[PDB]
Design a binder for these strands. Structure first.
Ligand SMILES: [K+]
Ligand SMILES: [K+]
Ligand SMILES: [K+]
Ligand SMILES: [K+]
Ligand SMILES: [K+]
Ligand SMILES: [K+]
Ligand SMILES: [K+]
Ligand SMILES: [K+]
Ligand SMILES: [K+]
Ligand SMILES: [K+]
Ligand SMILES: [K+]
Ligand SMILES: [K+]
Ligand SMILES: [K+]
Ligand SMILES: [Mg+2]
Ligand SMILES: [Mg+2]
Ligand SMILES: [Mg+2]
Ligand SMILES: [Mg+2]
Ligand SMILES: [Mg+2]
Ligand SMILES: [Mg+2]
Ligand SMILES: [Mg+2]
Lengths: 55, 245, 117, 233
RNA sequence: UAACGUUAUUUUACUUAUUCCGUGAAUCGGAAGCGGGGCACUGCCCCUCUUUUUGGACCCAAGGCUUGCUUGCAGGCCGA
RNA sequence: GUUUAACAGCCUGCCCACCCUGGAAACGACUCAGUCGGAGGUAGGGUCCAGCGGCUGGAAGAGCACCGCACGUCGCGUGGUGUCCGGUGCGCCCCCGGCGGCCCUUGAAAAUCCGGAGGACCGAGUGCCGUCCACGCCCGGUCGUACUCAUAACCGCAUCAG
RNA sequence: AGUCGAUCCUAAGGGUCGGGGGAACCCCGACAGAUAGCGCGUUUCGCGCGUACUCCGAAAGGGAAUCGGGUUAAAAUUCCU
């Protein structure tokens, strides 16, 4: 019954990233985790560079 | 003059294992470069019940070392692991419960489970619920490690064999009394057709060496030879002793 | 040569289409299921006549091997009449019966009179 | 211009996925390839008796090139040339009253004929392929050539010998005579071949071959020897 | 208890026969380079292969050098 | 006896789930039972989900009931009236929702369908490139289909108390 | 009968290639192996993926689509509207 020829597009889609697959809260958690993990990766890289410069 | 039950076991067709609802074999990742030299991180996604197996199993997702896809694995769950936990497998993995390490990297006195016998076999020792192996000593000269198995036997294995830190989850299962035949029926319904068991002395002579007689009794020593042929080898096989301790 | 896949795959080699020196069969076979072989005879029972009078439908006994498309084509060739739909069944005696309903442009009674039933 | 930037990839355990690499040494080859490689390995590992070992010492590159350059001018006539000669002879048979023709000087091929020529002491040089399979066909040929005092050489490629005589392969080739203009260089080549093969037959009769282990085990043995030498030093 | 020789029982070395294990046969062996450390003085020695606060994502090369000719773009080396 | 099918549109929005404001002990909310709340309750306002829910089209022209005229041998003829308004439930059959108990028992796979991450590649100026939108057009094979399903249509040597 | 089923999918299992056994009828059954092929653009050739069965096995498991009203001596969610 979900076939495209039988169901309208708006009925089988959600207008958001991962719409129809992940819930809103899960998508928010994923976005926040990605951003914070990238920031911590940058922090680790800069800390390593500073430590190498000091030594 | 009839084939006895123990003999009929080998042909199978009614004594085969019941595996319809099982989740697949539980084993480590195939040993590869990353686990041999570094470490590879995985995330526990689910802890599931495997019918016929006391120990729970953990679903772990790894990132494939050289392909763009997910590498899914099914490990025997160690007690203390949880969904969302990070699992590290390799020679450089930290010594924490749930991580899989080469025995060369595991210090003496550690508690491990699902220990490989041959390097790369993906785990054969200490897999049942509540069971574990203990690392005794290392031999750098010949690259071998000594472990204590659950039965108490001491075995020497190559130091490259892998093992998971900790003990298998689900321990203490056998301490609970069943209290009734129905519980045993349910237990063995998912394992194999080995229950209920009929005593040999309850049978007629034609189908068991213990059968027959106007009284119920064996009539001869229940200890049999190690080389006794099938159909005659019943009772206490090659017993070094009998009776209480 | 640089190989990026550990697994060996059989190389693709050229294949040739058959070009026989002689034809195994000298000539094409005859068409056994022609329009005359498809349409055996019209059914002239009371039910068939009622169908002709009421539903503008002709009833034919047809070769068991014939399908609905072949029945439609055979009816068109034999009597030059369009068919709205063809319904078929196999009778308990083992023969195939077809209910051929003509389009409104054609009158079943006139066609039956022309046929001679 | 300022919009272009580097995007370095960190390749390592748990890092960026590596690019396509050469996996040829790890390929699971078909059965034929695996067997043909393992046969060579096994032949290397096992000890080769001297009679078979003598076939591993072929002619030198320069000497082989010179010998084959000499042989290229004594090739047997091909089918077209033979047909042309036959039709010319037929045409000139009656008209020319069968004029005399000089005896041709060509290389001789075929194991039967070569063995017969050696036994009759007519051959002056015997060329033996080193890759005859089964090798029992020619393993005895060096001994026969030595006993008959006929210079012989072992060269690389039965296919090349066949190409000399317009055949897919040739087990061996023989020269019974050479032209006057080539006698001095033929004597040079014969002396070189005799010194290389015939004079060394007795010493090679007792030399075993093979016994070569794999590179990894060779490295292990070398490491053990180095450790022992350092300890004794 | 050794020069000669016979006999029997053990210990041990090699890998290609043979047997077994794993893989979608995916980095095996040696060496050398980038980096970190000791020495004393310009060389020696000792180490590593990049990923561990987080239930995220990660493929199909960016960049540099060099040729066809002036690029629809295409061909090589490094990157690896 | 006083009926309303598939299907199309609009409305509604159970029990849950989710979102916004706000920040709670004198703790409060709450079920038959439980349970929930600074990891954000009560409260106010919203989103979504089921429906075998409501209205309309289908559709009264149909079906049913009643009252009449006519041929009176063969008009499957001809006409009218009504099909309305409420209640009730530890009631019975089916479907669904949401909780709770039980397991050393945790109670299939695949075809198929839907969605998503990425973005190589791609087009024009009065026409080009796309378009899962609406309407319009054509086609849809083969075999089974009667009947009994049982104190006589199956088996039991039968039209057999099985 | 495009709409009810078979037909499609796979379950326990069955039947097999290759290989291994076997005097042979046959036995094991993807286990000893150059798999079937699948996508893009096309001078129909090139490029890229490709873990040895794309077979049988459910008229109660899974599953594309029909409803009223009418009609026969005997058929209908199949005939008529
Ligand atoms: K017996
Ligand atoms: K039983
Ligand atoms: K018993
Ligand atoms: K007895
Ligand atoms: K007894
Ligand atoms: K319907
Ligand atoms: K997309
Ligand atoms: K029927
Ligand atoms: K029936
Ligand atoms: K065989
Ligand atoms: K097989
Ligand atoms: K079915
Ligand atoms: K209808
Ligand atoms: Mg007793
Ligand atoms: Mg293959
Ligand atoms: Mg009415
Ligand atoms: Mg997108
Ligand atoms: Mg009978
Ligand atoms: Mg065979
Ligand atoms: Mg199929």
């Amino acid at each position: 019954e979900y076939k495209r020829s039988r169901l309208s597009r708006n009925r089988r889609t959600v207008n958001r990233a991962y719409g129809g697959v992940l819930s809103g809260s899960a998508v928010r958690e994923r976005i926040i985790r990605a951003f914070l993990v990238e920031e911590q990766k940058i922090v680790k890289k800069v800390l390593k560079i500073q430590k190498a410069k000091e030594k | 003059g009839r084939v006895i039950r123990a003999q009929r076991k080998g042909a199978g067709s009614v004594f085969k294992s019941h595996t319809h609802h099982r989740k697949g074999p539980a084993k480590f990742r195939s040993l590869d470069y990353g686990e041999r030299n570094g470490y590879l991180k995985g995330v526990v996604s689910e802890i599931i019940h495997d019918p016929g197996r006391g120990a729970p199993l953990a679903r772990v997702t790894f990132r494939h070392p050289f392909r763009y896809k997910h590498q899914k694995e099914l490990f025997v769950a160690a007690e203390g692991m949880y969904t969302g936990q990070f699992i590290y497998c390799g020679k450089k993995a930290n010594l924490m419960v749930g991580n899989v390490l080469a025995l060369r990297s595991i210090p003496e006195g550690a508690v491990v489970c699902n220990v490989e016998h041959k390097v790369g076999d993906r785990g054969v020792f200490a897999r049942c619920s509540g069971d574990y192996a203990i690392v005794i000593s290392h031999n750098p000269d010949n690259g071998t490690t000594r472990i204590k198995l659950p039965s108490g036997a001491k075995k020497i294995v190559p130091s490259g064999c892998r093992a998971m830190i900790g003990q298998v989850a689900g321990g203490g299962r056998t301490e609970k009394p069943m209290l009734k035949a129905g519980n045993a029926y349910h237990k063995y319904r998912v394992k194999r057709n080995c229950w209920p068991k009929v005593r040999g002395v309850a049978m007629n002579p034609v189908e068991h060496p213990h059968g027959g007689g106007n009284h119920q009794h064996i009539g001869h020593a229940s200890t049999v030879r190690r080389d006794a042929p099938p159909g005659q080898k019943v009772g206490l096989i090659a017993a070094r002793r009998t009776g209480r301790l | 040569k640089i190989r990026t896949k550990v697994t060996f795959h059989r190389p693709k080699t050229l294949k040739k289409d058959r070009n026989p020196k002689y034809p195994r069969i000298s000539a094409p076979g005859r068409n056994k299921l022609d329009q005359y072989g498809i349409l055996k005879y019209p059914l002239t029972t009371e039910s068939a006549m009622k169908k002709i009078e009421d539903n503008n439908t002709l009833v034919f006994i047809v070769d068991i091997k014939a399908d609905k498309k072949k029945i439609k084509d055979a009816v068109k060739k034999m009597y030059d009449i369009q068919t709205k739909k063809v319904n078929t069944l196999i009778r308990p005696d083992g023969t195939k019966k077809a209910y051929v309903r003509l389009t409104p442009d054609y009158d079943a009674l006139d066609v039956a009179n022309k046929i001679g039933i | 211009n300022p919009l272009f930037e580097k995007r370095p990839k960190q390749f390592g355990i748990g890092g960026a996925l590596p690019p396509k690499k050469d996996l040829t040494r790890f390929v699971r080859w078909p059965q034929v390839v695996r067997i043909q490689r393992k046969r060579r390995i096994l032949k290397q590992r096992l000890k080769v008796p001297p009679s078979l070992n003598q076939f591993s010492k072929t002619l030198d590159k320069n000497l082989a090139t010179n010998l084959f350059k000499m042989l290229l001018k004594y090739r047997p006539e091909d089918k077209a040339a033979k047909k042309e000669r036959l039709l010319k002879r037929a045409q000139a048979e009656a008209e020319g009253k069968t004029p005399e023709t000089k005896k041709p000087i060509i290389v001789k091929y075929g194991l039967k004929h070569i063995t017969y020529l050696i036994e009759q002491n007519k051959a002056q040089l015997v060329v033996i392929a080193h890759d005859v399979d089964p090798i029992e066909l020619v393993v005895w040929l060096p001994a026969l050539c030595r006993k008959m005092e006929i210079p012989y050489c072992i060269v690389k490629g039965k296919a090349r010998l066949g190409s000399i005589v317009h055949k897919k392969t040739a087990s061996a080739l023989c020269l019974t005579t050479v032209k006057n203009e080539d006698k001095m260089e033929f004597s040079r080549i014969l002396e070189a071949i005799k010194a290389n093969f015939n004079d060394k037959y007795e010493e090679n009769r007792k030399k075993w071959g093979g016994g070569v282990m794999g590179s990894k085990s060779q490295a292990r043995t070398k490491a053990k020897e180095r450790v022992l030498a350092k300890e004794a030093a």
